[PDB]
Design a protein around this ligand. Structure first.
Ligand SMILES: Nc1ncnc2c1ncn2[C@@H]1O[C@H](COP(=O)(O)OP(=O)(O)O)[C@@H](O)[C@H]1O
Lengths: 751, 223
């Protein structure tokens, strides 16, 4: 209530003329910032929202509730001055401009400004623009806590200072860091927005000092001995700068303390955890007394949809022949009707994220082990989608260009043979023409197949990327269930894709699989999918396996790149990581349960790119990050839990066997060892998804290489036609496989 | 006429700007420079709109606006950062031949700082890492040259040493930091001195590792 009255008084001080509706507006805005801000779930927020208006209308009749309480209530002083309320769209434009500028100075990584972020920016700005305005942010990892804190601090001129935590981080190091930040904030009169995560808070020794600093404004005992003498020496100069000449030591220390309160805002970024939050209350009450707390958890459907639209702007996703389906599976209520192809794709992506939330909640209800799902997973998914789409479209386009070059060469060769005919041999020439014509119509059919593939590529890539980024911790049955759910959702949206897509072959080639099998990797569907995830990832993969087969697999795979093994328990770890940054060799990590927070800059991919240099801030030291660096985190206990911070920075790769992996392995073993014909036909069907076409493409490249030498010598018997009839027979074989795919698939299903 | 009047005002403004630019870079105070530039801008804005519509006035106004924009780069350049080697790198990359003693704000302002913002920022960050490393070294020098052993009476028999924990912790921290200093691209400067101090740290570490055990044994056997 006191903060309420103080806030209303502050918003009323610069104004001189204000109607009653404006006063009710300020009252409602302050109520929402004080009471609705701290709420956790949706129902309480709606309850508070409706009851503020109810109380306002009950206590103040005869007022216009529209202007008095409009739905987008929002106050800021950036536009004009005097804390005058601002419309949402003009504020959005201003924040976009300032965000582009921020992009130019620091943190070029794109940010998307949806309504939630637009509100949190003003809340953080209001808290910063206040003496002793300490702030606590509670939200799921990757919701944009640190990023918005840094953005607002930069916009207000606050310099962000965050300590670097690691293992064996003794209290003396934190004492030195506190001394440095206090000296910078008070002695030099430079404002600091002090930001901490929960990695460095887990230790209870630091919480006493932080509590004292939050409450008293200065922590006694941090400055003593010669350190206190240097503090006083610089404090005298600071007083000289402000023209506040003082000589007594205790008065100078009081001035330093006041400078600290005026110019130090501490931001505590924490993940949502009821038991941990209660423990923090038990060990430090000021975190809920001095620190005003702000909650924003998972992004709403609007936020996910807007992020998807913005991050899929480079992508084509434009089908002029996209027929709208009646009864669209819709997860965004504001989806345009009728939606375009890009709108449908982004809606499907949001559905993928929400159905993964549903699957995780259902698995938690079942009693199994769940991993927290964060918007960073959505960003990783959309990045995989963009990369896969670009790669697959590039491959299809280059194959089409190769086919066009081949067709032009064939036309030139046919014209040359016609000119030669213009001059037993004539029958051979006629047979050559017939074969060339037939293979030409075959390549026209190949062009038609390429057009079909370009039609299906968007859906195929979407499903593949969703599998890569999202799945990985669940067993084989849950992976297949998620894939079937996504496929059915897309089929309801008329997003064209292959009905029998094969994940392993759409995401790899024959040579890659043979290389994997050369190393220690069993020919298991779960193992092949895990190898796929270990190949294509953006966040560094965290491998869990009770047998340790994956560790040996990635050791053999990266042996040529002098991969090194190092555990977190070993004290040399840091040093080894240093070498991994200097040289660029991969570095496998074991024993992830005892996580070292020093890895956070590596996992967060905090790269500073300046002056032809790429730097990583390992603790307090900047290191040149080698371009070909990669780190794998490994463990051996499936029954382990991970913090949401770690869970949101890595892609999980589960090697554990369950009732569905072992079932598939045993069924495949029986099929191979008792029905070799059925296993052969199954492999024929499963490799038909490009591998036969790849062999045809390679042999056609060889044929073009042979045919390029066409002058007389190619007519040794007027028939080099043996190579082209070889091509014709493999083409007829794969064609017959294509027409008879349903019968073979049904027979394999029956067996 | 009005054209003659605006030409005269332009000549006066140009004379003021040239007189301000005659100040050598050493004695150019960024705060006073910004205040004087703001005063000149206010003087320019005091002209009538008819005189303001002239192209030359617009050119000089936008030049002063660019100078105000690059005043931040001027502040960053005029510090303990550039020294003379970073200035040498800037001269080499910008292909300009100035004199350090004769350096003036006019020479730097002639070169487009706004166009060369990336180059200037890279040089500034290199200098940032450089004084970071240099001040870390100087801290090592001042903490080790002024450090004294904690001698204590021992039963009026002799003077022994305490403080093994603090001294060993300091040695370990310093040796770890010096060893890690071999990383980073900034390591290429002042390498030999860093190796010399590494050798000194190793020598003291070994000597006092032996010394603590010798002291313990001698106390025990004396008892
Ligand atoms: N509004 C947004 N639009 C797009 N990307 C965002 C937005 N907010 C956050 N992100 C991305 O999500 C990540 C946020 O991580 P962060 O919230 O800093 O983690 P933590 O809260 O654990 O510090 C950033 O890498 C950023 O790129």
């Amino acid at each position: 209530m006191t903060r309420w009255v103080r806030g209303i008084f502050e918003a009323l001080r610069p104004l001189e003329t204000l109607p009653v509706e404006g006063l009710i507006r300020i009252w409602a805005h302050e109520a929402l910032r004080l009471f609705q801000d701290r709420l956790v779930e949706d129902e309480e927020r709606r309850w508070t929202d409706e009851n503020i208006d109810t109380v306002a209308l009950k206590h103040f009749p005869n007022i216009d509730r529209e202007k008095a309480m409009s739905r987008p209530i929002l106050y800021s002083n950036w536009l004009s001055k005097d804390y005058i309320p601002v419309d949402q769209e003009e504020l959005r434009d201003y924040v976009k401009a300032r965000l582009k500028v921020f992009y130019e100075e620091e943190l070029d990584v794109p940010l998307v400004l949806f309504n939630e972020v637009l509100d949190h920016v003003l809340r953080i700005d209001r808290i910063f623009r206040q003496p002793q305005g300490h702030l606590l942010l509670i939200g799921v990892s990757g919701a944009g806590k640190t990023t918005l804190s840094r953005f607002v601090a930069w916009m207000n001129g606050l310099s962000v200072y965050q300590i670097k935590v690691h293992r064996k981080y003794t209290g003396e190091d934190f004492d030195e860091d506190l001394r440095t930040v206090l000296r910078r904030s008070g002695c030099k009169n430079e404002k600091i927005a002090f930001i901490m995560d929960e990695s460095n808070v887990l230790d209870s020794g630091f919480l006493e000092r932080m509590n004292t600093l939050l409450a008293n404004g200065e922590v006694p005992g941090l400055f003593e001995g010669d350190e206190y003498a240097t503090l006083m020496t610089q404090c005298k100069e600071g007083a000289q700068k402000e023209g506040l000449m003082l000589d007594s030591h205790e008065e100078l220390y009081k001035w330093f303390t006041s400078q600290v309160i005026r110019n130090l805002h501490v931001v505590f970024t924490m993940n949502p955890s009821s038991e941990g939050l209660k423990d923090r209350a038990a060990t430090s009450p000021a975190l809920f007394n001095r620190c005003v707390l702000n909650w924003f958890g998972d992004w709403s459907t609007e936020a996910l949809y807007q992020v998807g639209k913005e991050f899929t702007s480079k992508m084509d996703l434009e089908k002029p022949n996209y027929i709208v389906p009646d009864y669209m599976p819709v997860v965004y209520d504001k989806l345009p009707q009728p939606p375009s192809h890009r709108e449908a794709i982004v809606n499907s992506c949001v559905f993928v994220h929400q159905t993964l939330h549903q699957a995780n909640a259902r698995l938690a209800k079942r009693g199994g082990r769940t991993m927290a799902i964060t918007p960073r997973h959505y960003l990783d998914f959309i990045n995989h989608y963009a990369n896969l789409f670009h790669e697959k479209r590039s491959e299809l386009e280059e194959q089409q260009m190769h086919l066009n070059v081949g067709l032009r060469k064939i036309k030139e060769t046919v014209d040359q043979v016609e000119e030669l005919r213009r001059d037993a041999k004539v029958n051979r020439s006629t047979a050559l023409l017939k074969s060339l014509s037939a293979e030409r119509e075959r390549w026209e059919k190949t062009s038609e197949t390429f057009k079909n593939q370009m039609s299906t590529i968007a859906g195929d890539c979407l499903l593949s990327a969703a599998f890569i980024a999202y799945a990985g911790y669940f067993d084989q049955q849950m992976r297949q269930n998620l894939f079937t759910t996504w496929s059915h959702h897309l089929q309801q949206a008329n997003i064209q894709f292959r009905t029998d897509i094969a994940r392993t072959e759409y995401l790899s080639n024959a040579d890659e699989r043979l290389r994997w099998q050369a190393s220690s990797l069993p020919a298991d569907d779960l193992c092949t999918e895990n190898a796929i995830m270990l190949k294509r990832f953006n966040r560094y993969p965290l491998i869990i396996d009770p047998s340790g087969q994956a560790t040996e697999f990635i050791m053999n795979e990266y042996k040529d790149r002098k991969i090194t093994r190092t555990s977190f328990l070993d004290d040399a770890f840091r040093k080894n990581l240093e070498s991994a940054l200097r040289f660029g060799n991969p570095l496998l990590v074991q024993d992830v349960e005892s996580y070292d927070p020093v890895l956070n800059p590596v996992l967060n991919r905090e790269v500073r790119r300046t002056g032809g240099r790429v730097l990583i801030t390992l603790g307090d030291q900047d290191i040149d990050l080698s371009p070909s660096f990669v780190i794998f985190l490994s463990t051996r206990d499936p029954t382990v839990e991970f913090p949401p911070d770690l869970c949101s920075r890595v892609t999980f790769v589960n090697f554990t066997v369950t009732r569905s992996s072992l079932q598939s392995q045993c069924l495949n073993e029986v099929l191979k060892a008792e029905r070799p014909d059925v296993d052969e036909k199954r492999s024929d069907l499963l490799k038909l998804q490009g591998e036969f076409q790849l062999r045809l493409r390679q042999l056609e490249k060889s044929l073009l290489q042979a045919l390029n030498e066409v002058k007389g010598r190619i007519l040794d018997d007027d028939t080099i036609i043996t190579t082209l009839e070889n091509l014709k027979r493999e083409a007829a074989e794969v064609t017959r496989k294509v027409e008879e795919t349903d019968i073979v698939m049904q027979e394999v299903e029956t067996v | 006429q009005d054209l003659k009047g605006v030409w005269s005002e332009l000549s006066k403004v140009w004379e003021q700007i040239d007189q301000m630019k005659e100040q050598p870079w050493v004695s150019v105070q960024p705060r006073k420079l910004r205040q004087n530039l703001d005063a000149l801008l206010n003087q320019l804005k005091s002209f009538p709109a008819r005189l303001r519509q002239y192209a030359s006035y617009e050119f000089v106004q936008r030049l002063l606006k660019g100078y105000m924009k690059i005043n931040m780069l001027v502040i960053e350049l005029k510090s303990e950062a550039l020294k003379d080697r970073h200035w040498k790198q800037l001269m080499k990359r910008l292909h300009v031949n100035w004199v350090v003693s004769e350096l003036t704000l006019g020479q730097i302002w002639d070169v487009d700082l706004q166009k060369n913002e990336a180059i200037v920022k890279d040089v500034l960050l290199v200098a940032q890492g450089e004084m970071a490393l240099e001040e870390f070294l100087k801290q090592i020098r001042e903490v080790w040259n002024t450090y004294e052993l904690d001698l204590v009476n021992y039963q009026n028999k002799c003077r022994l040493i305490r403080g093994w924990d603090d001294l060993f912790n300091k040695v370990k921290e310093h040796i770890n930091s010096v060893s890690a200093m071999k990383l980073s691209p900034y390591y290429k400067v002042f390498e030999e001195d860093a190796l010399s101090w590494e050798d000194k740290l190793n020598r003291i570490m070994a000597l006092f590792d032996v010394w603590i055990d010798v002291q313990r044994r001698w106390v025990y056997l004396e008892g």
